[PDB]
Design a protein around this ligand. Structure first.
Ligand code: CHL
Ligand code: CHL
Ligand code: CLA
Ligand code: CLA
Ligand code: CLA
Ligand code: CLA
Ligand code: CLA
Ligand SMILES: CCCCCCCCCCCCCCCC(=O)OC[C@H](COP(=O)(O)OC[C@@H](O)CO)OC(=O)CCCCCCCCCCCCCCC
Ligand SMILES: CC(=C/C=C/C(C)=C/C=C/C=C(C)/C=C/C=C(\C)C=C=C1C(C)(C)C[C@H](O)C[C@@]1(C)O)/C=C/[C@@]12O[C@]1(C)C[C@@H](O)CC2(C)C
Ligand SMILES: CC1=C[C@H](O)CC(C)(C)[C@H]1/C=C/C(C)=C/C=C/C(C)=C/C=C/C=C(C)/C=C/C=C(C)/C=C/C1=C(C)C[C@H](O)CC1(C)C
Ligand SMILES: CC1=C[C@H](O)CC(C)(C)[C@H]1/C=C/C(C)=C/C=C/C(C)=C/C=C/C=C(C)/C=C/C=C(C)/C=C/C1=C(C)C[C@H](O)CC1(C)C
Lengths: 36, 194, 236, 54, 34, 62, 218, 218
């Protein structure tokens, strides 16, 4: 990080794993109706 | 009815195939997907910006997206040195913001917006049989890709320059003055043996 | 189609109908006007009596703003490419005629045409000619002659019906005679007007902040699109 | 040299063509096959909008 | 070798042109159909 | 000026939390577009204002 | 001197030659009766040739005045560079652009194929509009539209309008005859027409036509 | 039928007066309506112009292909003396006569006045036979006979032959316009036409035509 955005260095390191969770969100959303 | 198994005839693991006759929800699916692509392009870029070290060579750090910007030549000098990080930061943050707009549009069409645009919008509506309309949409996509190619041409010809690797004294960013557009040379590469 | 897209109930609004309800429109607008997008989030014209003078102010500001947006650039557009005209920065164009200024010509025609400096018989001439024209727009019939266009000011003026659209001697070609063509040109006039209106602020706030040439903003920004932004000027 | 050979490796020529004698054979087969197909077009389905799809 | 090379190009381009002008020649209607 | 960035950034992140939590719930409720509509309008407007304010302040940060 | 009816001013004159080519007795402007090669006996052909003569006259006025103007400007007060109207077409390749009126502040154009691509599209659209209307007044008269084309209205009185027809075609055929002289003394002397006139005002006949008359001996 | 009828594809699209010229509406192939001069108001004149245009077309196709073919073959792998159709005629005078295909064991033709005599005799024979009707076909149609010099027999159906008429005329008009292009290029650049194509494809913006724009300066 170049400048005063430096204290966001924890929440930057969570960002790229977030797009994978949409598949699991779709599976949980279709399990919510018990797959029907 | 719409999101049903026994009427649509498709199971839960073939759920996207229930959108074959649903233009608005199909559009929302695509725009949400483009939001995912732009969001990954922002997130991995800012991850590599946060983990980037400038004194160390770029291939020794396991980075893939920052060389794609350094090849265009933002924030680089002669010999392949790295002088700045703020262009990389801008290229991350702009994608990370625009992904929110695309995600909002995708969720709006996929939840509230109308299923069939062919009823109240005779422009955006389309039937899979309508060959003239399919060629229309293909024409719009080709025009957008042509402007996408001319953006790269303008960045090479007028805006700053591109990092050549064949400049003497090490690689260097230079401005292309005479792009060789000989047809007998350029249509050689498409035909040469693989 | 031509009148249907820009009049009636189902005209184009300033938001999509998926963001509207198509019944939450402020009810005193209801079409029948060119340039009607159902746009009033605050309600500054809630009586229909106010809408008449707002039409008048809108049309006057539009017709001044178009000429302003043309003349704010075209002499500067000549000088930055190399004309002989005295300085084209529009905010300093006034303080060049102060005690000894000249000018030039060739908007459409030829000719480098100087001017023997008339300034003190220009200020009062502006005041007198506008004191003619503005009271004529209020009520005054004015003189009649000097042959512009067709008609050539036959007697004085109409019997009425024209608070904003006289059109008698003002069509040298008879442009709008069909009502639908008239309505098309109404919509085009109000749209080009409103864009000129927003463009005037687009020149003005640049003249506030940057203090540079507005036509020169082209030759700086299109030349260098990352050397001239807000982010290069505000921080300095 | 010692012997005789085409020396066609590493050249980068379109379709591997060296002679124009070698080049004419491509068109001389392609055009005749196209002509036989275009004659055989008589006994096929040509139509205004009778399209073969969903 | 050139006598061989003309013959190889002839056979290859004959079979490839037969392929392409076969598939242009009304393929998805030679099925059992409906 | 650093704190002027960081308070606006925390506000932007928390507004984004509010969007990601509520806006799918408001959309998926069968009358949520009728009920919570001006709230979504004001939330999107506040989000855009925070983005533009952070973007303008990053020029003044030297 | 009525230029209509049986007493139009014949081109011959005193040998007025009654029993003319008998398919015309006035009634259209320009009619004298001079049909010696005999090409327009049919009425439809005669209508086509009225059309073609009128359009060539109305182009030839502009083609003559555009050769009158710039050498007079070079005489009086201006700067052009390639001032002669032959080499004025080659002002794109000249130095760095085409300075209209010699002012490098306005257009200063290059890219001859871009100028030609603008020209062909604009002229095709305006000629199609000249054929069958569209905008700018619907197609009402194939030769004499006048509706949007009278910002002054000189077509009020019918006898004066016929007089303006006859003056129009009299002042057209003169320009059409002059432009062929431009094109011939283009090839013969190579030089400017006002250059030749400024030679001929000074010199009565010592440089007249016949010094420039021994060219094509092979 | 789209190609001819009251709704053919006219020569300006929507800008074709929204009306034909008032004497031809279909009934013949190649009819778009472009007689703006009105030269064919009489039907026998119009028939003579078709009978002339078709023969100019059928000669213009062969005149195209016989000009193209030698710059293909000689520049590819053979020898023709000179293959450019300027110097195709001067191959009799050159060294030993005209070696057809560059082979001094077939024809090897000399004696140009004898070749001229054979041409005059045989072309007199065929151009008399085309008018009256002689051997290998009786005179029945001056333009579309349909006899022993049409061996494959494609003109049996009326509609397909009506389409092939329009195909022949369209290719004919294209061949004539191309041959006019060959002749004007032959005047201007003095080079072969396929040589002009290979010179234009190398640098399309500067070897366009406008480099050869100051050749004919007076
Ligand atoms: C009774 C006397 C009288 C005579 C002799 C003429 C003569 C003519 N008038 Mg007429 N007019 C006359 C009465 C009147 N005219 C007019 C008003 C008009 C008009 C408006 C017009 C004429 C025109 C004509 C011409 C018709 C034929 C033509 O085109 O010639 C052209 C052919 C020749 C002159 C023959 C060429 C001979 C020439 C000397 C050869 C040059 C020799 C060279 C050295 C050789 C060159 C060598 C080669 C290699 C280049 C002819 C010159 C028309 C015209 O101007 O046509 C050009 C025309 O538009 N007249 C009026 C007013 C009412 C008259 C009343 O008196
Ligand atoms: C609606 C748009 C439209 C326009 C603008 C045109 C334009 C034209 N079409 Mg057409 N077409 C159009 C629709 C269609 N056409 C056709 C199919 C055809 C055919 C088959 C033909 C045409 C032809 C023509 C021409 C008819 C008039 C003419 O002969 O030009 C005369 C005017 C000029 C030549 C002026 C050109 C301007 C140029 C800048 C001149 C260059 C100047 C040089 C410097 C001069 C050189 C100087 C000297 C010293 C050497 C004209 C160029 C005819 C044609 O082009 O034949 C050659 C023709 O045969 N069209 C179809 C399919 C149905 C159309 C459908 O929309
Ligand atoms: C990225 C891939 C993707 C996308 C875009 C979609 C999209 C869609 N699927 Mg789908 N699906 C997917 C993967 C995907 N699916 C996978 C992997 C499976 C296999 C498990 C399925 C199985 C499946 C089935 C079985 C069905 C669908 C259906 C649908 C459509 C309607 C969904 C619905 O009812 O919304 C309503 C959604 C909800 C009520 C849940 C709330 C979800 C919220 C909106 C999540 C948003 C989170 C995000 C952070 C918000 C950002 C906001 C922004 C402003 C910040 C929709 C267009 C259905 C259909 O055809 O429609 C008729 C259907 O029957 N899908
Ligand atoms: C990229 C373009 C693309 C698109 C738009 C589609 C679109 C479609 N396909 Mg399809 N497909 C694609 C590529 C594509 N496919 C490819 C590349 C393959 C080869 C593998 C297939 C193989 C395939 C089959 C075999 C079938 C389809 C079917 C379908 C239809 C319904 C899909 C659905 O709802 O499944 C819902 C989605 C799921 C259930 C997702 C399951 C997840 C998979 C199995 C593994 C995910 C791996 C992942 C990367 C692991 C990450 C790490 C992990 C630890 C989390 C739909 C029209 C089905 C159909 O009925 O067509 C009419 C069908 O039978 N497709
Ligand atoms: C290409 C994708 C796409 C398509 C085909 C549509 C099509 C449509 N949208 Mg829509 N939309 C999109 C993307 C798209 N949208 C996105 C990304 C968003 C999020 C901002 C929205 C948000 C949105 C809302 C909130 C609503 C619609 C509605 C509608 C429907 C009618 C009204 C309309 O078009 O005005 C929408 C007009 C605009 C959003 C103006 C766009 C602004 C300019 C033109 C963008 C120019 C950018 C340019 C193309 C460069 C590309 C950027 C980048 C990729 C390089 C119409 C079917 C309405 C509806 O459902 O009514 C029934 C509705 O209420 N849209
Ligand atoms: C965007 C430019 C524009 C357009 C489209 C219009 C459109 C119109 N004006 Mg108008 N007007 C404008 C700018 C414009 N105005 C400005 C800047 C002024 C102030 C000088 C005026 C002053 C004016 C008067 C005084 C009158 C009109 C009238 C009219 C109407 C019929 C005349 C016409 O067709 O003009 C079309 C104009 C153009 C196509 C522009 C031509 C291109 C320019 C010259 C460059 C029509 C609604 C008349 C009317 O409505 O009365 C019935 C009328 O009396 N206008
Ligand atoms: C030998 C030349 C020739 C002749 C006699 C004809 C004859 C005819 N054409 Mg035709 N045509 C030709 C060449 C010719 N064509 C060429 C080369 C083209 C392609 C551009 C066309 C395209 C064409 C169209 C599109 C149409 C015709 C039509 C017609 C018929 C009525 C028009 C008429 O009276 O023409 C009389 C023509 C002449 C007497 C020829 C005069 C030749 C001299 C030398 C003057 C030509 C100078 C030339 C214009 C200068 C520029 C040349 C360059 C453009 C090539 C008539 C049968 C119409 C029709 O119904 O078709 C049957 C029609 O719509 N023509
Ligand atoms: C280095 C550069 C490399 C360039 C590679 C170029 C690849 C070319 C690929 C062509 C694909 C064509 C697709 C099929 C095209 C097709 O669908 O055919 C069909 C089409 C006509 O279809 P229709 O049947 O509808 O015709 C209308 C009437 O027949 C309707 O009844 O014919 C063409 O348009 C041919 C177009 C030119 C094709 C090339 C010319 C062919 C002849 C040239 C051979 C010369 C013979 C010389 C003899 C010695
Ligand atoms: C914005 C603008 C407004 C112009 C207003 C005018 C001209 C009012 C005239 C206003 C003129 C007026 C009122 C004339 C008045 C004449 C009068 C009273 C004289 C008179 C008579 C008599 C004696 C014969 C008697 C008769 O019985 C009555 C009457 C009346 O006939 C012009 C801008 C530009 O000119 C600039 C500034 C710079 C250029 O580069 C750009 C452009 C755009 C061209
Ligand atoms: C009548 C009769 C009858 C009898 O019976 C027979 C006879 C005798 C045959 C006849 C006659 C005829 C005649 C005389 C004719 C003539 C004509 C002409 C000359 C025309 C021109 C015509 C001419 C013309 C148009 C011209 C035109 C021109 C122009 C446009 C120009 C243009 C231009 C210019 C601006 C200049 C620059 O630098 C360039 C250019 C671009 C180039
Ligand atoms: C229609 C119309 C109408 C209106 O009204 C009017 C007008 C306009 C007038 C018209 C038009 C017209 C036109 C355009 C025309 C054109 C034509 C042409 C060009 C032809 C060619 C045509 C052309 C042609 C034939 C050509 C031919 C050729 C040939 C044979 C060749 C031969 C040869 C060869 C092989 C080679 C060798 O080595 C030699 C030679 C010997 C050289």
């Amino acid at each position: 990080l170049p400048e005063a955005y430096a204290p966001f260095a924890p929440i930057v390191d969570v960002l790229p794993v977030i797009p994978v969770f949409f598949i699991l969100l779709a599976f949980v959303w279709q399990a919510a109706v018990s797959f029907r | 009815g719409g999101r049903d198994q026994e009427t649509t005839g498709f199971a839960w693991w073939s759920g996207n195939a229930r959108l074959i006759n649903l233009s608005g929800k199909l559009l929302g699916a695509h725009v949400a997907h483009a939001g995912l692509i732009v969001f990954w392009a922002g997130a991995m870029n800012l991850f590599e910006v946060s983990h980037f070290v400038p004194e160390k060579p770029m291939y020794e750090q396991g980075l893939i997206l920052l060389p794609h910007i350094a090849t265009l030549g933002y924030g680089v000098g002669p010999g392949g040195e790295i002088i700045d990080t703020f262009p990389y930061f801008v290229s991350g943050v702009l994608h990370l913001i625009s992904s929110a707009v695309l995600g909002f549009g995708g969720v709006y069409h996929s939840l509230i917006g109308p299923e069939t645009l062919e009823e109240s919008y005779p422009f955006f509506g389309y039937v899979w049989k309508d060959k003239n309309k399919m060629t229309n949409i293909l024409g719009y996509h080709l025009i957008m890709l042509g402007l996408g190619a001319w953006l790269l041409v303008w960045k090479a010809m007028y805006f700053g320059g591109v990092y050549d690797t064949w400049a003497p004294g090490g690689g260097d960013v230079r401005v292309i003055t005479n792009p060789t557009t000989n047809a007998a040379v350029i249509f050689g590469y498409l035909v040469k043996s693989p | 189609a031509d009148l249907d897209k820009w009049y009636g109930p189902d005209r184009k609004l300033f938001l999509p109908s998926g963001l509207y309800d198509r019944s939450e429109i402020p009810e005193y607008l209801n079409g029948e006007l060119a340039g009607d997008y159902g746009y009033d989030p605050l309600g500054l014209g809630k009586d229909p009596e106010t809408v008449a003078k707002y039409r008048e102010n809108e049309l006057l500001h539009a017709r001044w703003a178009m000429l302003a947006a043309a003349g704010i650039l075209i002499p500067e557009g000549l000088q930055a490419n190399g004309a002989n005209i005295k300085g084209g920065t529009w905010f300093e164009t006034g303080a060049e005629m102060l005690n000894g200024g000249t000018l030039n010509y060739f908007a459409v025609p030829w000719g480098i045409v100087s001017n023997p400096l008339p300034l003190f018989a220009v200020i009062a001439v502006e005041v007198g000619l506008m004191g003619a024209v503005e009271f004529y727009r209020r009520n005054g019939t004015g003189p009649a002659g000097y042959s512009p266009g067709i008609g050539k000011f036959d007697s004085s003026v109409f019997d009425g019906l024209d608070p904003l659209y006289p059109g008698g001697p003002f069509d040298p070609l008879g442009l709008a005679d069909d009502p639908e063509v008239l309505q098309e040109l109404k919509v085009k006039e109000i749209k080009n007007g409103r864009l000129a209106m927003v463009s005037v602020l687009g020149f003005a706030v640049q003249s506030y902040v940057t203090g540079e040439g507005p036509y020169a903003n082209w030759t700086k920004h299109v030349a260098d699109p990352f050397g001239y932004n807000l982010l290069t000027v505000l921080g300095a | 040299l010692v012997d005789e050979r085409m020396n066609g490796d590493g050249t980068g020529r379109p379709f591997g063509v060296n002679d124009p004698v070698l080049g004419w054979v491509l068109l001389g087969v392609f055009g005749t096959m196209w002509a036989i197909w275009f004659i055989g077009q008589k006994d096929l389905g040509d139509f205004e909008d009778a399209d073969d799809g969903l | 070798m050139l006598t061989l090379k003309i013959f190889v190009y002839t056979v290859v381009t004959f079979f490839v042109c037969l392929f392409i002008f076969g598939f242009l020649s009304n393929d998805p209607a030679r099925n059992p159909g409906k | 000026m650093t704190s002027i960035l960081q308070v606006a950034l925390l506000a932007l992140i928390f507004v984004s939390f509010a969007l990601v939590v509520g806006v799918p719930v408001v959309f998926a409720t069968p009358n949520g577009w009728t009920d919570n509509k001006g709230a979504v309008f004001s939330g999107l407007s506040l989000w855009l204002l925070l983005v533009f304010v952070v973007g303008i302040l990053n020029s003044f940060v030297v | 001197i009525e230029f209509y009816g049986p007493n139009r001013a014949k081109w011959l004159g005193p040998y007025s030659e009654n029993a003319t080519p008998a398919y015309l007795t006035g009634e259209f402007p320009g009619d004298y009766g001079w049909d010696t090669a005999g090409l327009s006996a049919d009425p439809e052909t005669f209508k086509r040739y009225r059309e073609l003569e009128l359009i060539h006259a109305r182009w030839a006025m502009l083609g003559a005045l555009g050769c009158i103007t710039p050498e007079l400007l070079a005489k009086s007060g201006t700067q052009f560079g390639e001032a002669v109207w032959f080499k004025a077409g080659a002002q794109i390749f000249s130095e760095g652009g085409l300075d209209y009126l010699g002012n490098p502040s306005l257009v200063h154009a290059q890219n001859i194929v871009a100028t030609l691509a603008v020209q062909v599209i604009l002229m095709g659209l305006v000629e199609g509009y000249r054929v069958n209307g569209g905008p700018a007044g619907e197609g009402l008269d194939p030769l004499y539209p006048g509706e949007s084309f009278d910002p002054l209205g000189l077509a009020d009185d019918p006898d004066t309008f016929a007089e303006l027809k006859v003056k129009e075609i009299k002042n057209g055929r003169l320009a059409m005859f002059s432009m062929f002289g431009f094109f011939v003394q283009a090839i013969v002397t190579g030089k400017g027409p006002i250059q030749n006139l400024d030679d001929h005002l000074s010199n009565p006949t010592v440089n007249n036509a016949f010094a420039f008359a021994t060219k094509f001996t092979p």
